[PDB]
């Protein structure tokens, strides 16, 4: 650029642009115009008494809201010109924490002074890390209630213990009200970590819930959910999903007065019939003599533990031998392996993606071009403005069809959130999700086991399929979830747009959910082929030069003729093919490129396409508080 004053002018212009962007971003959150700053609080250790920190933290003006069990309140101050909504959550409670930490603007972790955190705190913190962290602030409780010689050493040991999870972060202690004011000032001005899934949809936290039943006997009525819009512009015609109770359509949006203004009845919209999205998760439209033989006629409680140990032995025999399945000597091999075919190479051999599809794909939806549709939908979300309710407004939502028990849950203490979806999201498809195993659990998990999924504001039980995470057209089925591999879970589910965090839990015992896997959502398509491989092994027992006689791979004569076009490979690296069967039993002649060792073993690979099971149901049981054994 040269000309020093012009270079400094360029730098000043870039400074002003970045300053304008930052100041525009920081005006949206926790103020006169924007929605209230939601702060969730988790005490990581059991020795921490949360109500002491809550009465220390409440004092501006407080408005003590209440529920059945939890006690969350509303904070307002014009000294900092800032508006807060403080909520509490207890670790181990998977339901409440994972359901309402996905809407909080700032999480406040509480740490006991002596030890870092409890085991339940570690489990909850792993779940929060895996689900997507908002801006987090670390805070401690019992530092000032110690002698000074112990105070300094306690802070040193605590900062040593924190470093394994939070690498470098400052700790703000809370014992006095002045320290609480400093912490409030810290939370008011923070570098916000923006979560994408919250930003691309229209989420809402239920500040008040009312129920108007149409009929008591039907147990069906209208919900009146009043709260602050925090995502995108809330549109009535879009569908609404409640995180634990499914997706369904809305009726009306009205705007009452704001009960909590920073510096102190009319309806907005009713739904049209045609423009409203239709709730349809699946497709609507479905001569010989008497005695002579043929040879001459040619001339003319503890059961679960036993199953668990059997699963351990199956996993041990699956890792030390990858996919070798024994040929049954009772059933013919061409009958039990009727649907299996041989591929010349797993990467390059052709396979039609629409060749033999089950009747379950006749019930799902596909995308002609998923990337283009996602880009167009996101462009219509960000670049376009819709006439719905803006963010920061206190609105009431009349939702037509809900069950009664949801309202009952809101009176038990469980938080309620509801988010407005993107178009073409209520439909069902086949999600492909990349997940790796958490080291916390070591339970063996087969392919089609029944697991609970937290896939980006959704919760559903399902039976996935596990595959290699490759770039090829074909992906081999993994019969077990390997610890260090990153695998792909493929299962029927309602379709959602990435980015989305994915959690895989397992119902262990007594309603205790065990986190077994975590990851994110890859591109969604049912065209991702999952291939189950079966390896048949045979023993070469007569070895000559370049050809051999092999037994025990089959047991009939026509079984060898059935699998003749499939080539054989060898554990010591030889490649060959079957020439001719000789015995009436499963003896066969095999030619190879080299000479086989006497220590050697021939084997062939057979391939089939496997499709996931349809075990989708949105109902998931409420977890008990988590505890170690």
């Amino acid at each position: 650029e040269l000309s020093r004053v012009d270079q400094r002018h360029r730098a000043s212009q870039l400074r002003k642009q970045k300053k304008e962007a930052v100041l525009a971003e920081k005006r949206q959150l926790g103020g006169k115009d924007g929605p209230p700053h939601q702060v969730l609080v988790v005490p990581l250790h059991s020795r921490i008494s949360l109500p002491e920190a809550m009465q220390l933290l409440q004092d501006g003006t407080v408005h003590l809201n209440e529920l059945g069990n939890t006690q969350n309140f509303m904070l307002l101050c014009p000294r900092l010109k800032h508006r807060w909504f403080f909520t509490s959550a207890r670790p181990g409670d998977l339901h409440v924490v994972l359901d309402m930490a996905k809407v909080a603007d700032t999480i406040l972790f509480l740490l006991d002074p002596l030890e870092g955190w409890d085991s339940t705190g570690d489990y909850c913190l792993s779940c929060l890390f895996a689900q997507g962290l908002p801006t987090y602030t670390l805070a401690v409780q019992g530092i000032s209630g110690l002698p000074l010689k112990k105070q300094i050493d306690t802070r040193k040991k605590l900062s040593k213990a924190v470093e394994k999870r939070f690498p470098h972060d400052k700790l703000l202690l809370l014992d006095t009200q002045q320290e609480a004011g400093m912490l409030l000032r810290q939370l008011a001005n923070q570098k916000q970590q923006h979560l994408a899934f919250r930003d691309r949809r229209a989420y809402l936290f239920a500040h008040a819930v009312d129920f108007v039943p149409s009929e008591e006997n039907n147990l069906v009525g209208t919900l009146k959910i009043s709260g602050y819009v925090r995502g995108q512009t809330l549109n009535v015609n879009r569908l609404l999903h409640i995180v634990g109770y499914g997706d369904f359509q809305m009726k009306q949006i009205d705007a009452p007065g704001d009960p909590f203004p920073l510096n102190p009845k009319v309806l907005m919209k009713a739904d049209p019939g045609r423009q409203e999205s239709l709730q349809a998760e699946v497709i609507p439209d479905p001569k010989v003599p008497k005695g002579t033989s043929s040879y001459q006629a040619e001339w003319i409680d503890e059961e679960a533990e036993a199953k668990m140990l059997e699963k351990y032995k199956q996993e041990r025999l699956e890792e030390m031998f990858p996919d070798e399945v024994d040929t049954p000597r009772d059933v013919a091999a061409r009958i039990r392996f009727q649907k299996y075919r041989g591929l010349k190479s797993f990467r390059t051999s052709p396979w039609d993606p629409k060749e033999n599809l089950p009747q379950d794909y006749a019930r799902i939806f596909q995308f002609q071009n998923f990337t283009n549709t996602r880009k167009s939908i996101f462009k219509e979300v960000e670049e376009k403005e819709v006439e719905g309710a803006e963010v920061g407004w206190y609105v009431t939502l009349h939702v037509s069809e809900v069950p009664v028990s949801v309202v009952e849950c809101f009176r038990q203490g469980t938080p309620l959130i509801a988010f407005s979806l993107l178009p073409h999201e209520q439909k069902m498809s086949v999600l492909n999700m990349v997940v790796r195993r958490d080291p916390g659990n070591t339970e063996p998990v087969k392919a089609k086991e029944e697991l609970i999924f937290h896939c980006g504001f959704r919760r559903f039980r399902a039976s996935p399929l596990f595959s290699q995470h490759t770039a090829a057209d074909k992906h081999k089925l993994q019969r077990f979830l390997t610890a260090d591999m990153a695998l792909v879970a493929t299962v029927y589910a309602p379709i959602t747009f990435p980015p989305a965090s994915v959690l895989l839990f397992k119902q262990k015992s007594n309603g205790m959910h065990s986190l077994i896997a975590t990851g994110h959502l890859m591109s969604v398509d049912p065209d991702r082929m999952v291939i189950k491989r079966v390896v048949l092994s045979g023993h070469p027992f007569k070895i000559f030069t370049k050809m051999a006689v092999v037994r025990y791979m089959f047991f009939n004569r026509e079984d060898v003729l059935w699998f003749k076009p499939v080539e054989l490979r060898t554990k010591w690296g030889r490649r060959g093919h079957i020439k001719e069967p000789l015995g009436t039993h499963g003896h066969m002649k095999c030619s190879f490129d080299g000479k086989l060792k006497s220590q050697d073993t021939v084997l062939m690979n057979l391939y089939k396409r496997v499709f996931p099971k349809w075990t989708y149901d949105p109902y998931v049981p409420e977890p008990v508080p988590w505890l170690k054994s």
Partner: peptide, 18 residues
Amino acid sequence: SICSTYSNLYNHPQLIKY
């Protein structure tokens, strides 16, 4: 009748067009 199949192309899922 060894590694031969017919495999007719039926029951495809409905696709959302762009």
